[PDB]
Symmetry: none
Subunit: 223 residues, 2 copies
Amino acid sequence: IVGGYTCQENSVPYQVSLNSGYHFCGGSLINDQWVVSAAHCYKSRIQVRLGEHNINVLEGNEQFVNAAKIIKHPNFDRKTLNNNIMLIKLSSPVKLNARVATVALPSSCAPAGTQCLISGWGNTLSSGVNEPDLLQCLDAPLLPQADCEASYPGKITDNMVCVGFLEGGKDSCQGDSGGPVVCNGELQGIVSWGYGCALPDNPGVYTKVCNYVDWIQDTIAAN
Amino acid sequence: IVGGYTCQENSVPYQVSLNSGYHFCGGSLINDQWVVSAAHCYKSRIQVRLGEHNINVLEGNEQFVNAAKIIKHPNFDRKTLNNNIMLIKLSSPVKLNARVATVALPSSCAPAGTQCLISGWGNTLSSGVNEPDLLQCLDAPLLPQADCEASYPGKITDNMVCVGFLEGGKDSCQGDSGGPVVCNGELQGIVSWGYGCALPDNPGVYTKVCNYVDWIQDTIAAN
Ligand SMILES: [Ca+2]
Ligand SMILES: [Ca+2]
């Protein structure tokens, strides 16, 4: 998260860190045993970490659970990033408390101009390297499709949405990938791609969750 | 036991010590004349030691009985350790008292997350040699089958259960083999195998007692 702020502790209860020796991607908790994240964050062995705040210090509220199943969307396209979404079924169900809590799924799609919350333990700078220890938060709105498509000529699908600022300075970055975009208590996006981080005229491009409610449900009823 | 504590004296009345000139394996008393253990703990001549606490000092409470019959499970695979259970018929029936007591057999297969008791006079270190004099105890839960198979690829059968901690530090070790895992006053496991002792991602493997009640009773009734 470039240009956001440090989230108040345990204030995005549904955020998870995907661990593979170190943090590499975020996701979000949809029920007690399923996490949604991004196909591009696929790894054959993932440990999910919940109730985190400081990613590099054991604080006493974490639950560490292995992925039992890792299911990329059948139409995931690596080249284009189309359908970038994946589901993770945890080896066991977590303990739901004030710090580990689900996030709802959209009842419809949120229109452009809606105000959303974005979070992650991804890069905090436009140029250079800085990985934070504390979870960063970012208030940003969905942008009109028109604006999304002009930024990325012929690069945008019916399942991608841009969230951000055309001016730059405030964005998601590497390490935020698979994490949540939440709009009026609902999971509307998933960090997917962008050119650089927080550059002018290159807003974040996100997976549009509203297009996959049916899939999810389905996937979870079948596994 | 690596990471456990000194059992309170005579607190695990059903523990036995398999003796061949020295303690080499554990086991549990199931009736006044039958003990259960692992098939790998098979020796043609065994002396059973009941009422023990300090493996190495005579305390006034022990009963020393020879094994009159030693029955390995017919399906016992040496290579794989599948069917890792045996039955020992003692030469005479013991004296049942507060220090030499039986343990119940399973009424059902206990579920992942059940809290269990593991005990033994096995190695107490994760690296290095340390064989204790006093019987050691460990509180550990049964783990989801999912974690168990993820730990030991193509190694886990329907008759094996993992018990312990994925983070390592606390486990059974050589010399604990054949001992009991008691959960809710019943015999859910027998120490079987593991890679090393108390290493991260190498939880112990146990014989799933609940798949056997029927063979046991079968066994005790025919001999
Ligand atoms: Ca932490
Ligand atoms: Ca003794």
